[PDB]
């Protein structure tokens, strides 16, 4: 010859993948990586977040002190997990802003309770019921105090409780709506009257309303549930003619990174920073298609189930 | 591609090249050989790894948020909670779809670049001792044993040594 | 000499449109397409979406059964259109969270009503009035049953109505507020009373409010409107001393693509996927500038009134 | 033009070429003429149609949403409902502005690329029988009748049968 | 020897800046410009936006007419500035929708008050209290009229006040909740009062709750604050048998660029379109890391504190 | 860069050039030249100024909004107000991050482009009178005084004035 020939080229592969670009929406490159997490194991990992399985207990039931929720006293969590099998097994209750209370308690992230003695005078304390048995024995919500007549007298109550500590106190109280006029008098002797719970910034008034409610667990009555926050240097102040389901103390209002989630996924011993109701998912990808409900360092939820990012050149095979 | 080399004037790739992304293939009287080019292969990988690292990372760490499923008809406030989350999901789904399209368009275009860059780097080395055949191959107009083709891949090829022989064979 | 010249070039047009780029604010290309729909015809097309023109009626008026809205009974819609000229012409009323009741009925998409027999004993039914004239004579909301004294006596009412079906039920009821103490006794015999409507999941209590009002269309009084959803297996429980505007049955609540819109645009014989209060607009373009209120397969509302997308190369004349 | 061919080293375009986007003009012994190039015209048109269909794709279908106009002053809940829709509109208005700007910048640059790719194809084909005049044209140093031109417009120009005639006309 | 040489090149600098790209996280260019405004003088410029310094008065207190806030009467603003040192010095009060009332008044942007003569009959007016002193002299909110009994009599008030102007009217009124059953009868002779405020589209009814509230400036009562908007053609209608804190007139309610901001920054004499609680900031950059709370023509808040936009080429020096 | 000129076949930049972004250094019998090229410098500056003005266009003008800081616990309605503002900030933070990354990538690639366009502008001018030495420099094969060099920068270089002198030295 006295001649040589030098050819330049690029590599190719047999398998290849399709990705989308600005111009084509299916074009073949040598290699791509998935950007959308679309699968979970089905199990929540109990590290590195304090997970608290509520089992048969709702966060509201545990807050009030339902007897079968006794194991949740003074408990704290990063993520509280409510199960669809949860039930209530105490006195019938109702919460006007149930979602708000559930939210603020979940965000606070603990049930650490501090006892307080309020000084009720002239009334019987520690009322119980056939519908809230702690051992076939009658009892009540562990964190509420049912006030009723004492030797067939019920004097009007006036009570203060100052917040001299340095944080915010959360009080949970209630009002009793008996089913019959005669049940009203056998309990509080007087006809229905008011409950006025106030602070220097909050103002709440409940008027008991006697009436037949749906029979639940042996009774046709219902308790309404209300909440009050007391700032430092402020004062909680209760004035009630009767029908008062009194608080036994206060919860601490922390403010952290805790929340609540509805799931039935089992809890393993594993490690992943992201939690979804469908279980834990890895966060090595920037997007996910598992669930829009997430907690932790999670990929961002998107509608696509696959987004292939090209990690190689165009694949042009041979003939 | 915008540079016209991959799926362009290179008619196809080499499934037989496994030690690199871009490379060489030659023929002497000594026989034929093949060798990858480390420099251009590295340049393309480092860019793609770099963009891959930009894409896959924190932060989206959220903790207590709004409720997104509802067992009850509630009306006004629940409509708003649903609308906020639906708005957020559409916007990110758009951001994700557009990001991949731009990145993949640029990934394809920068790999075409490095192929074209290796070709021009080689054309400048050979000066007047070789001619572009148009298909990615050069025609070298002087006997080149395995030593000098390895001095081209190497960047040590000195063209003044073969200029006399090459110019004669080109011009008749 | 034996020459030849071969010139490579691109086309151009005397025409040119200006487009926006990353680098230049106006640069001329050979051709571009508009991406922003900015004009409407002014008319709503009657297909593909099942429009229901409310004309002189509002959805709530049709829900309750205002006599001049009787033709809306058991009507179904994809998009209900409310008109600014609508009016009320029955007994005066107000709805707390009016916007909510309107929303949940509008997204339900129908007014299919189903009668139910409530065991009301000792009480007269079918209370009538003028200011709600159903042609000359006196009558009431078609879906509401006004209960009043029977021989000047009003026994306290306590009736139940369970849900044994596979769907949610919507109950609309009311509470009467007479404008004088005498009106309260002339209708229900007793003084100020109580109304208690309950499910296992909800709890609703209204205390009537006796005292004067802006007398509307001839009467001293007004009605409050409430709703109650009863899920399958649950129970409706009504107990009232009086002042109860009882329901006559339930509405079937559905979930679907139904909604409501305020517009005075005329309805036309044509087809168009996207509906705005300005009328229908085409949806061949990705964005629109007509109105942020839309219904259906619509372009996304944006602030710009034009965005030209280049569909050709740079245009370089040719003087 | 990122590639410097359209509005670059090609002084202007041809309003007289209505059968294609890119093409050839020629001058020889038999006369002058003009023919569009189908391959590069189809390449550009196909890329522009492809990106146009992705922009127009159109998945956005909403039904019952929040209220967006109000006849009464309500305060807090209404402040939020307006703030949500305003935030959504500003975010989509940004997306639409940026999309058009990026796409148009890419449409100008890719149509510029095709022009350059067609010029390089032609140069590689002519080998040593032609010289770049710097304006988009080639000096062809030998006799090139219509069939010879028609053979350049198309991938079948054998430079070897004209090389000796051309190389002598180039060097004297 | 017939030689020559011609080298092409580009400039560099000895000190480049680092910027981010799609592929490299940090790469050196000859020059860049910052896009995130991260600093501020710490002072609010009083131009071109009409600023109103709230001093020790919150907007609500200036609305009602707290004695130490009388210098705020009939003032306009584009931006009202509430200070953290504000205090209340009049009768203790409570606004059920405090955020809402604060929002709507702030958006209206003025406190232009107009006297109207309501025809109160058979009652004393201009009631005062020790808790709200003007000097050592007892007085009250300047925009509220405290009605109480005259000669052991409180006739049921009924007043009409029609809006015949061309703008909307904002009326502010209240209901007095006395601390004891005796305070009630001393002031309003009736055991428990009532208050009805109506337009042709509104029904606000309040029954006062008698009970002890937190001791404030020698007073254990409190005042609920309510607001009502009357459009042209509409009428304002009030009936009361006791406990009414009556309005003295209306506020003109405009709509426009007015709002409110909480800040303790000082107000200098300069010009700046963008305002934040941390002070005014320049708006030449598209983004700012100062504060998510902004007023006016501001950059958009982002989480990043620096974003370098390259304004030169790659900077490549030698060694 | 995608065009492999800056940080590519041109080994580094000139800290000694301050009156222009791109320029010519030359050498001949009267040594010592350096001059900046205004046309290419102007082109890169116009585009960079053009995009810099697009990104600081300054449209956001908001007045009465929602409250974004809260001193009391309010639960559900407040969760939503925080979620709305949080969602909005994350989306604009993403837009800002992506905007900078795209513009800076494009700025590098367009400045690299102008360098390459100037090289191809010079290469076409010189025709057969010079050769690419590989480091962004041409070896000119004929006597070229400072006036002749200036004609190359002014775009007034007549190549066949020197074509016979140049082709001699090239092939001898
Ligand atoms: C239902 O239950 C509630 C509470 O359980 C009852 O409300 C209570 O009512 C009483 C009577 O009105 C009221 O008592 C005095 O309160 C203020 C408080 O002043 C400062 O003190 C508080 C508390 O810190 C104190 O704590 C320890 C122990 O508790 C004390 O020993 C310390 O000294 C602390 O002060 C603190 O937060 C602030 O620093 C308060 O500013 C007080 O001002 C009044 O005292 C007056 O009492 C006499 C009235 O004439 C008089 O003799 C006093 O000298 C004083 O005021 C005089 O001073 C002026 C000169 O400066 C004179 O010119 C003027 O004429 C006046 O005479 C209050 O009397 C409680 O605060 C209050 N509690 C609450 C929580 O509201 C309620 O009544 C009950 N219901 C019914 C129907 O009875
Ligand atoms: C206003 O109108 C409402 C609606 O009607 C009305 O509410 C009704 O109140 C009654 C009375 O409390 C209540 O009656 C029964 O409720 C229970 C339903 O239970 C279910 O489960 C049973 C087993 O699965 C099943 O057989 C039932 O058919 C039903 O499916 C039921 O448990 C109650 O059971 C007691 O009934 C009598 C009580 O004397 C006894 O015969 C029974 O044995 C049983 O319990 C007795 O024995 C236990 C031993 O364990 C003992 O501890 C206890 O003290 C008790 O004496 C009732 O039969 C209706 O359910 C309820 N209706 C509802 C909720 O819709 C109001 O009462 C009305 N208002 C006024 C003022 O009248
Ligand atoms: C307060 C009370 O327990 N009431 C009982 C009621 O008892 C009254 C009744 O015996 C009458 C007639 O003789 O006499 C009253 O006392 C008078 C006294 O004799 C006289 O000396 C004095 O002068 O006057 C007083 C009047 O106050 C009695 O008070 O009997 C009825 C019928 O048995 C009860 O209804 C039934 O309740 C059952 C269980 O209810 C509990 C429960 O488990 O829920 C017991 C709890 O101890 C009680 N709570 C407290 C704090 O005491 C609760 C509570 O009263 C209700 O739950 C409220 O709704 O009830 C059964 O489950 C079913 O619900 C009823 O048939 C009534 O509770
Ligand atoms: C329930 C009723 O009919 N109310 C009428 C009221 O009727 C009472 C009145 O005639 C007095 C006379 O002093 O007698 C009462 O009967 C007594 C009688 O001696 C004896 O039979 C019984 O044993 O003792 C009772 C003691 O009370 C009557 O009950 O008359 C007044 C004055 O005319 C009416 O007010 C006027 O109402 C007008 C609107 O009326 C209707 C209507 O068209 O809306 C008629 C409807 O039939 C009625 N309701 C029902 C359920 O049928 C409604 C409804 O009551 C009101 O709308 C409620 O506001 O009213 C109009 O408003 C006019 O301006 C009023 O003066 C009162 O309605
Ligand atoms: C609380 O405050 C409000 C303030 O407005 C007071 O309400 C105003 O006063 C009365 C209600 O008590 C309203 O006047 C009523 O108008 C009705 C309309 O009647 C029309 O038709 C009659 C023929 O029947 C025409 O002659 C007339 O022009 C009317 O246009 C009447 O139905 C009422 O009259 C009734 O009583 C008289 C006396 O028995 C009979 O002769 C009548 O036939 C009829 O039965 C009455 O005239 C007035 O409109 C109310 N104002 C507003 C703005 O609505 C409350 O009184 C007050 N409450 C207190 C202080 O307790
Ligand atoms: C708020 O807290 C206070 C503090 O406890 C509380 O005050 C109490 O109110 C009741 C009722 O208003 C008072 O009891 C009344 O006292 C009067 C004295 O004038 C009596 O007339 C009443 O008894 C009857 O007297 C006659 C027969 O004895 C009858 O002919 C007559 O009709 C009355 O019915 C009744 O006992 C009590 O004195 C005050 N206590 C104090 C310490 O001031 C108030 O009730 C609370 N409010 C609530 C909870 O809403
Ligand atoms: C919920 O539904 C139930 C079911 O109807 C209903 O219960 C009934 O309420 C009435 C009213 O309280 C009761 O009737 C009482 O019966 C006794 C017999 O011992 C009478 O002595 C009572 O007289 C009272 O009223 C007089 C005034 O007229 C007073 O002067 C007297 O002192 C008494 O206070 C009264 O008539 C009835 O017993 C119950 N139960 C049944 C099975 O009927 C209840 O009212 C509903 N709740 C509501 C509507 O809020
Ligand atoms: C589709 O329907 C939309 C709603 O009907 C239309 O939007 C309207 O477009 C018109 C354009 O002509 C705007 O024009 C005017 O705006 C001002 C209002 O200024 C203020 O006036 C007083 C101030 O004292 C006060 O009442 C308000 O604060 C007003 O803001 C007036 O000159 C007119 O009344 C008219 O409103 C409208 O503002 C605008 N309305 C809305 C709700 O956006 C749209 O134009 C229709 N067509 C298309 C193709 O989109
Ligand atoms: C307060 O109530 C009285 C009595 O109902 C009203 O007096 C009559 O009002 C009606 C309609 O408002 C008029 O048609 C009558 O002319 C009034 N009486 C007389 C004798 O003419 C009075 O108007 C009510 N208060 C206000 C402010 O309107
Ligand atoms: C490159 O390889 C050739 C032989 O193939 C050799 O001549 C040369 O020295 C090598 N380069 C270096 C830096 O050793
Ligand atoms: C209807 O309700 C009454 C109570 O008011 C009851 O006595 C009667 O049995 C009920 N009717 C039937 C058919 O059960
Ligand atoms: C360019 O250079 C040539 C020769 O040096 C000179 O004749 C001509 O006038 C110059 N033109 C400009 C515009 O500098």
Numbering used by the authors:
A (entry chain C), C (entry chain A), E (entry chain E): 8 to 326
B (entry chain D), D (entry chain B), F (entry chain F): 1 to 172
What's in the article?
The trimeric HA protein is critical for facilitating virus entry and infection of host cells and is the major target of neutralizing antibodies. The HA can be divided functionally into three major regions: (1) the receptor-binding subdomain (RBS), (2) the vestigial esterase subdomain located lower down on the HA globular head, and (3) the membrane-proximal stem region that is responsible for the low pH-triggered membrane fusion activity of HA in endosomal compartments. This antibody mediates inhibition of virus replication using multiple molecular mechanisms including inhibition of virus egress and mediation of ADCC activity.
To further investigate the antibody epitope, we determined the crystal structure of H3v-47 Fab in complex with H3N2 A/Minnesota/11/2010 (Minn2010/H3v) HA, at 3.57 Å resolution. Initial phases were obtained by molecular replacement using high-resolution structures that we also determined for H3v-47 Fab at 2.57 Å resolution and Minn2010/H3v HA-LSTc at 2.90 Å resolution (instead of the apo HA form at 3.15 Å, see below). In Minn2010 H3v/HA, there are only four N-glycosylation sites in the globular head region (at positions 63, 126, 165, and 246). The only two glycosylation sites N63 and N126 in the HA around the near the epitope do not make any contacts in the antibody-antigen interface.
